[PDB]
Ligand binder design. Structure first.
Ligand code: HEM
Length: 291
């Protein structure tokens, strides 16, 4: 099935910058969430999980249809906690009821990355809501207890190569694992609501110990109070991934540029953009607007 991008009727860049801005202003205001981490990280994860159900083989799942709004997908165990990002976006959607669900979930992720001082992420509109029966089944999002071979094979289904996977994993600088949500506990670093290449630096430079958490799952822990999932740690066990981790640990601009591309791609899998669709938008941050 082909999903053709269809611009919300009569809308243009300024309309979407207003939605961006409303998201960004609420991100600034609602700062208490998650022990003052704020909503940035969970909004990035929401964009990823709403996109990461995609299957390149048959074009099922993906960001286009905004299917997270249906109970099968919002109750996926893999999505535990993302309801906080959805609830954040509710008043945004009420103010701007013309935006599609897929466009709002993906735009929330773009807005969060940029407001957290991350790279610019070009973003295209035109996702169209699809019906409840187009919601993908549970089980398309990845397990965390696995090795590098798992990670590599997993991401082939999303048409991501080694560089794209290692870049995308850099988003694990953000936020934290929560025991009751995933069976893992702890942040990956100190700067967890500012977008940096810290994930790579910590992988290479902390002294990691393989421990069991209070849910009886293994994770890697450091004396600084940081953690890595087994799938994170797999990026330094596999020699191909390791080379790329070192590259991003040593070049912040390269990480930014490669993350931006990979994240846009993730958010756009499955969508056909007509030849005469608008160019991708690059939104100004609040800071750049003086707001
Ligand atoms: C092998 C792939 C991946 C696995 C197994 C994985 C697993 C996890 C797990 C278990 C959590 C903790 C959830 C919780 O307890 O709250 C988490 C959090 C998070 N992940 Fe992933 N992840 C992967 C890839 C990605 C990608 C590709 C991105 C986005 C580009 C991403 C962004 C995030 C963010 C931002 C958080 C923090 C959420 C928060 O603080 O609420 N992850 N991930």
């Amino acid at each position: 099935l082909v999903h053709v991008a269809s611009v919300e009727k009569g809308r243009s860049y300024e309309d979407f910058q207003k939605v961006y801005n409303a998201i960004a202003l609420k991100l600034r205001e609602d700062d208490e969430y998650d022990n003052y981490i704020g909503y940035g990280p969970v909004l990035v994860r929401l964009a990823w999980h709403t996109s990461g159900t995609w299957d390149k083989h048959d074009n099922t799942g993906g960001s286009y249809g905004g299917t997270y709004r249906f109970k099968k997908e919002f109750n996926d165990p893999s999505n535990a906690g993302l309801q906080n990002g959805f609830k954040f976006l509710e008043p945004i959607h009420k103010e701007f009821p013309w935006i599609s669900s897929g466009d709002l979930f993906s735009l929330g992720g773009v807005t969060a990355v940029q407001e957290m001082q991350g790279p610019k992420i070009p973003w295209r509109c035109g996702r169209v809501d699809t019906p409840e029966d187009t919601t993908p089944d549970n089980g398309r999002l990845p397990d965390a207890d696995k090795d590098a071979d798992y990670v590599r094979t997993f991401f082939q289904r999303l048409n991501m190569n080694d560089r794209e996977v290692v870049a995308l994993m850099g988003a694990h600088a953000l936020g934290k694992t929560h025991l009751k949500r995933s069976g893992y506990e702890g942040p990956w670093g100190a700067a967890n609501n500012v977008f940096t290449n810290e994930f790579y630096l910590n992988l290479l430079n902390e002294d990691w110990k393989l421990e069991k958490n209070d849910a009886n799952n293994e994770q890697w822990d450091s004396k600084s109070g940081y953690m890595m999932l087994p799938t994170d740690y797999s990026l330094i066990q596999d020699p191909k991934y390791l080379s790329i981790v070192k590259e991003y640990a040593n070049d912040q601009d390269k990480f930014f540029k490669d993350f931006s591309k990979a994240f846009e791609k993730l958010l756009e899998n499955g969508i056909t953009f007509p030849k005469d669709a608008p160019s991708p938008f690059i939104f100004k941050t609040l800071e750049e607007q003086g707001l």
